[PDB]
């Protein structure tokens, strides 16, 4: 059943149940008074006067807030706290190595951006320009980032676990100007050759855009350098000036893009803009996490993911908070070492993913031992649903039962938390999101856009805007259009089913598209198959998930060769190290299913529906019991 609000949450909750109900009314029939107070959250150069200014309409898809207002992103993360603030930590930073830690007060954190923002001008790098980040989990990515928006610069965070080709490809989507990255990664006693990936990155022909690449000297190793276009971190900045004045930007100048997997074709730049953008991300910050002054926060999340933009960096920036940034793993070099970074920094707020969980919770106890987790308050989750009970393991094993948890549904799409708990307010179902956010209206429908009402289930539906939606896919509007507005006209759709109870909670199942949740990473099936038939060796390639027991998906690939072909171990691995070169570890295949009995229809589409089912272990009708056999072996 219910999970009833704690004493100590109920006494120091911003948000209690009553003033859930109000807001949240308030939210949608008077939006414009609403977040018209609420962006007050932030320091405006010149204040807006337009509050909401949306259209989802066919062929006027349109998605404006605070239009008329103008702010700097770095100044309300920094400058803004200097004052009262200045010595308080903004960044803890945990290595990998557990002997190697910093903290990084306001003031130091705002001295490096100063730094960093007017390296970047005078490198030619002007607002508006795309700049490539691909780092490792160290605070010069934070700092990369955050003199890329005090400049208006838009930066384009690569997760470091991409391939050279995976980079490249975003690099020549974006036409990025320069490439910020670090000799090695260090990520479980192991280095990560950020840097030498990106030497094989800017081979590909296909890239023309980057000029420079800056290179942090994290680990020392040797690598290769190319005179001129290679630029030490440490040599720049120190030569550069502490003294910046940011600029007023528009509330609609772009902020971001961050590559997305998609239900069809190649990943595309989701962009958000400044105003509404970090509206959003501070207010749910604050509220979802009950963030007090002094809390100290941490969000396991890499940077490289919007999870990282908005709730590593931007919201608890914005608020003026203490934000862990872990280096490593939280079960290397044991699955203690989560709670012991925990113990080591005082945590309070917690916030991570059901695949780290799940791979703590099989290591039972073990997770726990000789840690002490008192300082714990709030517990959060995201990125895919999490089962009852690692629900209940989680909240019993590591907030000790005391700590209400937040299972935060949200997309890269939406910029910030779109279902969840508030932990004052909202009773918690394991294994629920429970209710929408401030200025959040879900609906269910099915197939063919009827709106379902009451306990039933559909297609996830968002009716309206809110400030912190994506405002388009770079460079493609239409596309932006026809991905999200076309199949439900009006109607912003997820991609995912819900079904909603007699309480009105949601319970997010997860794609109803062919897009695939791997370790918590959002992949299209699409781009694996194009990646396998790549391969000289393939003709055809049907790609599904299957359930796994940490992974929460594995990744399953029906591969037919070209005729003559024969498969074999080495194959095998051939095909899988394929996968990894042309997107990264994180889409290889976990099963390669080598078959001539693609099942496809009258006019020659693959019907998944079946493949799914086979591999889940349960026209040329013939097809079926080959498929059958071939899963048994
Ligand atoms: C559970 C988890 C901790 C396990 O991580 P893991 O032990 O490294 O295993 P993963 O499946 O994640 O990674 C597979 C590979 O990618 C590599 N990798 C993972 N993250 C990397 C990174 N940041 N940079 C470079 N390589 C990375 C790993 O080293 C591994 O490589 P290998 O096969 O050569 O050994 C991790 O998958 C995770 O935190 N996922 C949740 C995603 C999330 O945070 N959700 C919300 C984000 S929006
Ligand atoms: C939120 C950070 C992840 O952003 P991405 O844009 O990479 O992926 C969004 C998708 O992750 C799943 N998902 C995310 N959170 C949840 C969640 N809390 N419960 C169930 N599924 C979830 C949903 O299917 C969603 O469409």
Redesign the pocket.
């Known amino acids: 059943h219910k999970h009833a609000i704690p004493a100590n949450i109920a006494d120091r909750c911003l948000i209690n149940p009553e003033q859930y109900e109000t807001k949240y009314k308030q939210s949608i029939n008077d939006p414009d008074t609403f977040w018209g107070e609420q962006g007050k959250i932030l320091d405006w150069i010149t204040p807006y006067q337009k509050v909401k200014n949306t259209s989802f309409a066919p062929g006027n898809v349109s998605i404006k807030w605070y239009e008329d207002g103008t702010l700097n992103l770095a100044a309300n993360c920094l400058d803004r706290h200097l004052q009262e603030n200045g010595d308080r930590t903004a960044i803890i930073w945990e290595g990998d190595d557990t002997s190697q830690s910093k903290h990084i007060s306001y003031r130091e954190l705002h001295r490096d951006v100063c730094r960093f923002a007017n390296t970047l001008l005078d490198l030619g790098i002007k607002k508006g320009d795309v700049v490539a980040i691909y780092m490792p989990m160290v605070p010069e990515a934070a700092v990369a980032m955050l003199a890329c928006a005090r400049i208006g610069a838009v930066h384009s965070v690569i997760f470091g676990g991409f391939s050279p080709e995976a980079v490249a490809g975003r690099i020549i989507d974006s036409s990025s100007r320069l490439v910020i990255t670090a000799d090695e990664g260090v990520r479980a006693g192991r280095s990560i050759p950020l840097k030498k990936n990106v030497d094989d990155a800017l081979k590909n022909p296909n890239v023309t855009s980057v000029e420079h690449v800056i290179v942090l000297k994290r680990t020392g190793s040797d690598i290769d350098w190319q005179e001129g276009r290679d630029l030490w971190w440490r040599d720049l900045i120190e030569k550069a000036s502490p003294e910046h004045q940011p600029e007023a930007m528009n509330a609609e100048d772009p902020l971001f893009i961050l590559y ?2 998609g239900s069809t074709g190649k990943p595309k730049g ?1 962009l958000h803009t400044t105003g509404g953008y970090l509206v959003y991300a501070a207010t749910t910050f604050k509220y979802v996490f009950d963030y007090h002054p002094g809390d100290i926060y941490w969000c396991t ?1 890499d940077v490289g ?3 990282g933009h908005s709730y590593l960096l931007y919201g608890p920036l914005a608020c003026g908070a203490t934000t862990l940034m872990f280096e490593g793993v939280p079960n290397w070099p044991t699955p203690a070492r989560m709670c012991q970074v925990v113990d080591k920094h005082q945590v309070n707020i917690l916030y991570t993913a ?1 695949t780290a969980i799940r791979a703590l919770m099989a290591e039972g106890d073990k997770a726990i031992e000789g840690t002490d987790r008192s300082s714990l308050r709030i517990l959060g ?6 089962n009852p009970e690692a629900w209940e393991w989680y909240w019993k094993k590591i907030g000790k039962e005391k700590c209400p948890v937040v ?8 910029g910030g938390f779109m ?2 708990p508030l932990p004052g307010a909202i009773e918690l179902k394991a294994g629920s ?1 429970t209710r929408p956010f401030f200025g959040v209206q879900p609906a269910l429908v099915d197939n063919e856009g009827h709106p379902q009402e009451g306990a039933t289930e559909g297609n996830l539906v968002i009716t309206d805007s809110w400030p912190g939606q994506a405002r388009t896919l770079f460079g493609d509007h239409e596309r932006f259009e026809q991905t999200y507005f076309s199949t439900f006209k009006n109607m912003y759709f ?3 089913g819900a079904r909603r109870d007699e309480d009105g909670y949601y319970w ?4 109803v598209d062919d ?1 695939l ?1 791997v370790s ?3 992949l299209g099936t699409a781009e694996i198959e194009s990646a396998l038939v790549a391969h000289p060796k393939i003709a055809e390639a049907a790609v599904v998930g299957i359930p796994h027991a940490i992974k929460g998906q594995a990744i399953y690939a029906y591969v037919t060769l070209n005729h003559g072909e024969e498969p074999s171990p080495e194959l095998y691995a051939e095909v899988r190290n394929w996968v990894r070169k042309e997107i990264g570890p994180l889409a290889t295949p976990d099963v390669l299913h080598w078959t001539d009995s693609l099942p496809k229809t009258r006019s020659g589409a693959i019907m998944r529906r079946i493949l799914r089912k086979i591999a889940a272990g349960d026209a040329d009708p013939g097809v079926v019991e080959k498929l059958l056999e071939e899963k048994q072996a």
């Open positions: 997305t997997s989701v999340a993911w919007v999870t059901p989750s995201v990125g895919e649903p999490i299972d935060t549904w949200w997309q890269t799409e939406t279902i969840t999101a997820s991609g995912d997010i199942t997860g794609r897009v949740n918590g990473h959002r």
